[PDB]
Design a protein around this ligand. Structure first.
Ligand SMILES: NC(=O)OC[C@@H](O)C[C@H](NC(=O)[C@H]1NCCC[C@H]1O)C(=O)N[C@@H](Cc1c[nH]cn1)C(=O)N[C@H](C(=O)O)[C@H](O)c1c[nH]c(Cl)n1
Ligand SMILES: [K+]
Ligand SMILES: [K+]
Ligand SMILES: [K+]
Ligand SMILES: [K+]
Ligand SMILES: [Mg+2]
Ligand SMILES: [Mg+2]
Ligand SMILES: [Mg+2]
Ligand SMILES: [Mg+2]
Ligand SMILES: [Mg+2]
Ligand SMILES: [Mg+2]
Ligand SMILES: [Mg+2]
Ligand SMILES: [Mg+2]
Ligand SMILES: [Mg+2]
Ligand SMILES: [Mg+2]
Ligand SMILES: [Mg+2]
Ligand SMILES: [Mg+2]
Lengths: 52, 100, 117, 88, 64, 102
RNA sequence: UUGAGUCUCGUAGAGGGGGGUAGAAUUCCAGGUGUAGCGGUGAAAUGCGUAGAGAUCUGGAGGAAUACCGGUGGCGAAGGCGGCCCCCUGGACGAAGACUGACGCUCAGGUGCGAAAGCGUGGGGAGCAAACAGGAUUAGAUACCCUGGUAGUCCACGCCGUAAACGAUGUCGACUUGGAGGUUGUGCCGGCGUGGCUUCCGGAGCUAACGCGUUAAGUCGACCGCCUGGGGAGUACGG
């Protein structure tokens, strides 16, 4: 997973900008952890939004 | 030891970015700098406002360097009042391939 | 006085009370009305109906500004969330965007202790 | 931990060969190298109790290896501690 | 939960979409849990009993 | 109107409530002293005290035991209190002396 | 050389210490707009507001904590550990080898670590809140409820050394039917294996029973700790 890959990451965030559970998306636990890191890094750089 | 440096510049200061990108790479290539990737992403739309700015000039650099010179580069970004944000990361390997 | 074409309806819907406030688009207050000021007192305030009345009186306060469009900005878990906006639309404002504010801390401050009741 | 180059130096010095990583001399030399290296760490980071538990394990493992070498071969023991500059 | 009323939509339909947007996003449940302080032991205990219940229902779904 | 405030300041006048300590024909020194303390406080803090003794079943046949308790209270709370009311008859099963701040 | 270590390569992880930093939220301050309520409860009142509150919007200040991810998920000897980033650092595990050659296991005394409260000194102090102040309730109300609120909670350094510090189950090793999951390696050709950690059920066996059941409370061995009716008492005395 990559923090720069906004297209893929946007599939695993909601409209509000919240990370979706692995039970919903069917992601494996290892990748779900990488995904969560990537999204938070993207949030820091203002590539993704935190809220709203 | 394989870093990845993103930094975002004040969008009005997109003209300064030419001179700064030189200085950073010149310092890194001074001491066994391996500029694996360098991508001027350009003035992108921010997902939220940073300092009442809705745009900023993004830059990416994947470099191998001394762990001292990167800390010395991080010191400059703080002092650079134009540059608004930066994430220095550690990569395990070199990244040569292009990002979107 | 000034005329305003489009307004914003801020609905502070607490558990105990509803405050409806119509502002300009830049959040300048035009008129306000509460369930507590609508001839409801105590826990009478904390009903959907008392909020409905508060909405209507708020609409009546901002008749002079000549508003037809409102953007709704509901906030809180109050019983009068939906009853306000229903009654706002009944006043004859065209409701554009309908939107949930509701401040959520991303952790934030330690809340008060649980009531032992 | 020590670097791969730092390890490879010690194995060549204190070993009978580069292949000989097992010998008590190498082991004690490796443990000594890391123990001495971490003295700077715990000087700054006094409250790092979790890491210090790892250091005490190194010291305890060195002691046990030295005690083994003493009763196995005093000549090897005496040479080793003087090289590394260990009191005992 | 931001709900722009789209090109020619009724209010009652639009209100159903707004309420559902809030329901999915988790706003009323979130405010209520943040109303009073829950100390970590209570949090952990609550999380365990849920996990026991969830799992035990699967063993009731099985054996049947 | 904030007029109200006037009352808030008016309401900084005062108020006396009567507080009711119930004694029983055979309460013991310990608890007497606890309840006696309660009254001292009640009274010193500007309040009245409906002191009630509450005969139960046959105890109503030795009312004179009761009266002695009341008379002890009167005689202890002497310098703090004046005795609005004393009882003589035992209406119901009760004897309801009311003391007030001296 | 089979126990125990070392080396090579790789993997996962809220393991630890230090520094920086992001967004949300509460409070406060300064303004703008605005007008009579706000807040609170079982019901009220205290409280706050026309010296303009609450609400709404803009900006600023400061402290504390990190929503979602988040999982009978992970890591750690235990206590415990959760934004992101860097620096320093400990352990675990797998694959093939190569190496040392019993270097081992346990451990009275000893030494260190050890939640929260607490203590000393100096900072800090948003929110929360023992004590306390006022408002209620009541037969009373030294409470539960309401409005405030100090220590403290936070940081540094030192001290304290206790918790239902619990799996109420000491550590190490060997052996003994199964089933369904989770998490993390790895080989081979989604499938077929094979390691580590972990959740639930259950067989023999064990158990007073409840239950435990290859992560044993089964079958054995090594070493340590501890118990010997209840209360008196984890108290007195002494160290
Ligand atoms: N005071 C005395 O000596 O006797 C009176 C006492 O017995 C009253 C009784 N009180 C209660 O149960 C407490 N429960 C805990 C919260 C506080 C309090 O409420 C009670 O009946 N409550 C009522 C409210 C009330 C107080 N005085 C007169 N009425 C009540 O509604 N209690 C609730 C219940 O019984 O379930 C509940 O406890 C509650 C909700 N809100 C509050 Cl306050 N209490
Ligand atoms: K800067
Ligand atoms: K020993
Ligand atoms: K305080
Ligand atoms: K039985
Ligand atoms: Mg752990
Ligand atoms: Mg614990
Ligand atoms: Mg042992
Ligand atoms: Mg503490
Ligand atoms: Mg102190
Ligand atoms: Mg408080
Ligand atoms: Mg309180
Ligand atoms: Mg104990
Ligand atoms: Mg025990
Ligand atoms: Mg079982
Ligand atoms: Mg047994
Ligand atoms: Mg004692």
């Amino acid at each position: 997973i990559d923090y720069k890959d906004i297209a893929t990451l946007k599939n695993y965030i909601t409209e509000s900008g919240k990370i979706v559970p692995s039970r919903i998306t069917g992601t494996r636990a290892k990748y779900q952890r990488q995904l969560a890191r990537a999204i938070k890094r993207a949030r820091y750089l203002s590539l993704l939004p935190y809220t709203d | 030891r394989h870093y990845e440096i993103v930094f975002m510049v004040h969008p009005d200061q997109s003209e300064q970015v030419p001179g700064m990108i030189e200085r950073y790479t010149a310092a890194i290539t001074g001491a066994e700098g391996k500029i694996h990737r360098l991508e001027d992403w350009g003035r992108r739309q921010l997902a939220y406002p940073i300092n009442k700015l809705h745009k900023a000039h993004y830059v990416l650099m994947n470099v191998e360097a001394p762990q001292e010179v990167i800390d010395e580069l991080e010191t400059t970004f703080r002092f650079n009042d134009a540059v608004i944000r930066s994430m220095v990361m550690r990569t395990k390997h070199a990244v040569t391939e292009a990002s979107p | 006085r000034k005329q305003v074409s489009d307004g914003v309806a801020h609905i502070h819907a607490s558990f105990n009370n509803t405050i409806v406030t119509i502002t300009d688009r830049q959040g300048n207050a035009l008129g306000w009305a509460t369930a507590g000021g609508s001839g409801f007192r105590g826990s009478r305030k904390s009903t959907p109906f008392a909020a409905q009345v508060a909405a209507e009186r708020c609409a009546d306060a901002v008749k002079e500004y000549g508003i037809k469009n409102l953007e709704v900005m509901v906030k809180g878990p109050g019983p009068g969330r939906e009853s306000t906006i229903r009654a706002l639309n009944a006043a004859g404002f065209r409701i554009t965007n309908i939107t949930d504010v509701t401040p959520i801390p991303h952790x934030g401050c330690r809340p008060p202790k649980k009531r032992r009741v | 931990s020590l670097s791969t180059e730092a390890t490879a130096k010690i194995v060549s010095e204190f070993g009978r060969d580069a292949n000989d990583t097992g010998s008590t001399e190498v082991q004690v030399a490796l443990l000594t190298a890391q123990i001495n290296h971490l003295q700077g760490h715990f000087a700054e980071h006094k409250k790092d109790h979790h890491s210090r538990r790892g250091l005490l394990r190194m010291v305890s493992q060195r002691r046990k290896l030295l005690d083994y070498l003493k009763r196995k071969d005093v000549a090897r023991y005496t040479q080793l501690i003087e090289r590394l500059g260990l009191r005992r | 939960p931001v709900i722009k009323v789209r090109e020619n939509e009724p209010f009652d339909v639009a209100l159903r979409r707004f309420k559902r947007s809030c329901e999915k996003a988790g706003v009323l449940a979130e405010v209520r849990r943040r109303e009073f302080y829950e100390k970590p032991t209570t949090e952990r205990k609550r999380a365990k009993a849920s996990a026991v219940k969830r799992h035990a229902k699967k063993l009731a779904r099985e054996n049947a | 109107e904030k007029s109200k405030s006037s009352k808030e300041q008016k309401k900084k006048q005062k108020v006396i409530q009567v507080k009711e300590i119930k004694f029983r024909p055979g309460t013991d020194e310990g608890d007497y002293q606890v309840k006696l303390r309660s009254l001292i406080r009640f009274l010193e803090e500007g309040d009245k005290a409906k002191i009630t003794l509450r005969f139960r079943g046959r105890e109503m046949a030795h009312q004179q035991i009761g009266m002695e308790v009341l008379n002890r209270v009167k005689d202890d709370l002497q310098e703090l209190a004046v005795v609005e009311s004393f009882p003589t008859k035992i209406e119901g099963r009760q004897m309801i002396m009311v003391l007030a701040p001296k």
